[PDB]
């Protein structure tokens, strides 16, 4: 490619490639895939893409954009980076430069969701106005595409519409304003916008690049937090106090909206699993909900620093 667009601030690399396609008038998706990559047997995805390195070579002349910058500043990697581990994170980072499309989605256990969770395209009504009044274009943003939060952190709620990623797996789609956005009346809770705004700063943080605890570290940090809050018995649990803490902090409607409905009647529950020994990579929400319910005056960055300190 001769003129690969410079990515904007806080934008998905998928939208960067889509804008590269829309700039040079490549209507046919196959031609675009051949020109950008050279292999017609790839899979396009939103967040955690693969085949990186060819894009960084397309941006070779500009010295700032490298593989690390694109990995940590234009994909959804920061959400999956600290919680998954250290050696697994390093292996995933090393693997993103290669052509293993399924490996990035498979090795990260948190990313191994099999069936896509709402593969439809999202957008925010107010953010498009700001983007048009500042940059002149419309593009996907890492704030909107949280894996399980359909809520913009600054504003109230997103607005879905037709089409989905899996509808056409060989095409890159770019949002358009004049194409009438499917705006219809929306109602949103005020207990989830706060969670979105609490999780949002984790995306843009230089400290998160070299900050990722381990499984045993996670277990020790959670046990120490439970000991400090006093919600645990002698080598046991209150088994109810942790329930009403999250019940008061977050309503049941929000939890059922996020598909984390409480099941304290049954032993098997995500909260109980978190309190117990940690055996895999829990998603970001399972940590953020507990963090906001237990320590409301600490944000994500210093919480991660305290967890990884000991």
């Amino acid at each position: 490619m001769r003129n690969f667009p410079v990515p904007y601030s806080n934008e998905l690399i998928y939208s960067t490639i889509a804008r590269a396609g829309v700039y040079q008038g490549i209507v046919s998706p196959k031609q675009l895939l051949d020109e950008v990559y050279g292999n017609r047997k790839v899979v396009a995805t939103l967040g955690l893409p693969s085949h990186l390195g060819v894009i960084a070579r397309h941006l070779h002349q500009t010295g700032r954009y490298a593989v690390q910058q694109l990995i940590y500043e234009h994909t959804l990697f920061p959400l999956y980076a600290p919680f998954v581990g250290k050696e697994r994170r390093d292996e995933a980072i090393r693997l993103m430069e290669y052509q293993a499309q399924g490996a990035v989605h498979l090795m990260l256990g948190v990313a191994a969701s099999r069936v896509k969770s709402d593969n439809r395209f999202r957008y925010c009504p107010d953010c498009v106005a700001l983007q048009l009044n500042r940059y002149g274009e419309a593009f996907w943003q890492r704030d909107w595409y949280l894996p399980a939060l359909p809520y913009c952190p600054k504003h109230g709620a997103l607005v879905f519409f037709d089409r989905a990623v899996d509808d056409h797996r060989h095409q890159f789609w770019a949002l358009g304003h004049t194409e009438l956005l499917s705006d219809y009346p929306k109602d949103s809770l005020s207990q989830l916008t706060a969670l979105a705004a609490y999780i949002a700063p984790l995306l843009d943080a230089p400290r998160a690049q070299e900050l990722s605890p381990s499984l045993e570290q996670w277990t020790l940090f959670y046990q120490r937090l439970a000991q400090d809050l006093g919600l645990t018995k002698s080598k046991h649990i209150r088994h109810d106090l942790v329930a009403e803490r999250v019940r008061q902090t977050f309503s049941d409607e929000a939890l059922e909206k996020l598909d984390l409905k409480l099941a304290e009647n049954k032993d098997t529950c995500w909260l109980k699993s978190i309190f117990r020994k940690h055996r895999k990579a829990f998603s970001y929400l399972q940590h953020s909900i507990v963090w906001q319910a237990l320590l409301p005056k600490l944000t994500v960055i210093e919480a991660l620093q305290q967890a990884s300190a000991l």
Binding site: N3, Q31, R134, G136
Partner: protein, 402 residues
């Protein structure tokens, strides 16, 4: 193909040219006094080169037409106009305040729908402006342009952005009034100046005429092309049915809507094509038409300073062991009479006369030798220069390109 030059930003003093990098990376325009010496060129002609053998000494005389230029009193105006229309055509495509990207976003509708006038943003203006260049053949329409545009780096690469700014591009029409070969020649000239492959990527898919028209204009804005120059516009006069108007409309919709300035060079045979309609002429000739005429001996009752400063300056490039220190008025008179002011005939006649003077043995240039060379080695161009010499409008009405 063309060397790529990194960009350095100066400080333009114009309020309208506030921060636009495209018109901040361009070299500054010189003054009127320096425009008559920034283009002049001449052969070295070492004074020790007169003692060499005939065969070696005669292979440097044949370099005079290629390496001799004297800027007249019109090249200044042409250069000023070119600079104005190449700097004022970038104010509508400022990349800093999100204005170039709006033009590209409007270009997806044309490549997707096929209708060129499909506006998506109503706040994207066009200020390209257009120029027309007409002059008799052999008067130096291309040799002046290749020396005026030679002061611009063509391909400039910006590092803060990732855009390769092609300052100017030079193409020419097809021998027939083609509709698709023009769009293919655009790609063929574009990838050669960039070392890419655009001709294969666009065209091998067997696209339609309108789709190709949209593809060409979209890549003409993906790279911030500043000036499009099409050479020998008289070619399209031999088009098919409708070929003499479709591209006349396309070249007035590229400069008025898309925003890329265009300059067209052609012999006076294209005036019939370009006078088809007022709305098809004035829009395509916004600056008007620049008419070029051969040098005239006398302007205000006295000998022209241009003709004298051309002839007397050329006279000092003689590789003759028995050359003349001064130029007699008789030699000048016969030289003008046997050339009729055309740029090409003067230099070619001088070179041929000098070569024959070397070959014969008598190394002195005289009116008789000039006449003999003219009658010997200028056979095809006799009747037309004769018609120009006569001055009768009826004779000039046919051919002679005037």
């Amino acid at each position: 193909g063309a060397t790529r030059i990194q960009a350095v930003y100066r400080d333009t003093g114009v309020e309208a040219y506030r921060d636009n990098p495209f018109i901040e990376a361009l070299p500054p325009l010189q003054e009127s006094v320096n425009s008559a010496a920034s283009l002049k060129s001449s052969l070295q002609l070492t004074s020790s080169d007169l003692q060499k053998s005939r065969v070696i000494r005669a292979h440097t005389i044949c370099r005079i037409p290629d390496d001799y230029f004297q800027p007249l009193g019109t090249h200044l105006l042409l250069s000023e106009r070119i600079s104005v229309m190449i700097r004022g055509g970038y104010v509508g495509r400022n990349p800093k305040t999100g204005d170039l990207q709006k033009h590209l976003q409007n270009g997806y509708e044309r490549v997707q729908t096929g209708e060129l006038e499909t506006f998506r943003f109503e706040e994207a203006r066009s200020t390209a402006q257009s120029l027309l260049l007409i002059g008799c053949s052999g008067s130096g329409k291309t040799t002046s342009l290749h020396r005026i545009l030679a002061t611009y780096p063509q391909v400039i690469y910006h590092r803060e952005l990732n855009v390769e700014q092609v300052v100017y591009l030079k193409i020419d029409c097809s021998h027939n009034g083609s509709l698709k070969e023009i769009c293919l020649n655009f790609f063929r000239a574009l990838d050669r100046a960039l070392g890419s492959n655009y001709e294969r990527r666009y065209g091998l898919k067997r696209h339609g005429i309108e789709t190709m028209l949209a593809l060409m204009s979209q890549i003409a804005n993906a790279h911030a092309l500043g000036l499009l120059v099409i050479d020998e516009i008289q070619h399209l006069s031999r088009s098919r049915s409708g070929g003499s108007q479709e591209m006349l409309n396309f070249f007035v919709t590229m400069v008025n809507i898309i925003g890329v300035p265009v300059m067209l060079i052609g012999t006076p045979k294209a005036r019939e094509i370009f006078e088809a309609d007022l709305r098809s002429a004035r829009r395509g000739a916004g600056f008007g038409a620049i008419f070029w005429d051969p040098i005239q001996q006398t302007q205000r009752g006295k000998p022209n300073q241009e003709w004298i400063a051309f002839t007397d300056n050329l006279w000092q490039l003689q590789l003759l062991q028995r050359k003349d220190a001064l130029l007699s008025d008789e030699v000048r008179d016969v030289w003008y009479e046997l050339s009729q002011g055309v740029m090409d005939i003067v230099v070619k006649l001088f070179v041929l006369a000098q070569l024959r003077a070397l070959a014969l043995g008598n190394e002195r240039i005289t009116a008789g030798l000039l006449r003999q060379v003219y009658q010997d080695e200028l056979k095809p161009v006799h009747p037309m220069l004769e018609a120009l010499r006569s001055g009768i409008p009826e004779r000039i009405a046919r051919y002679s390109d005037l």
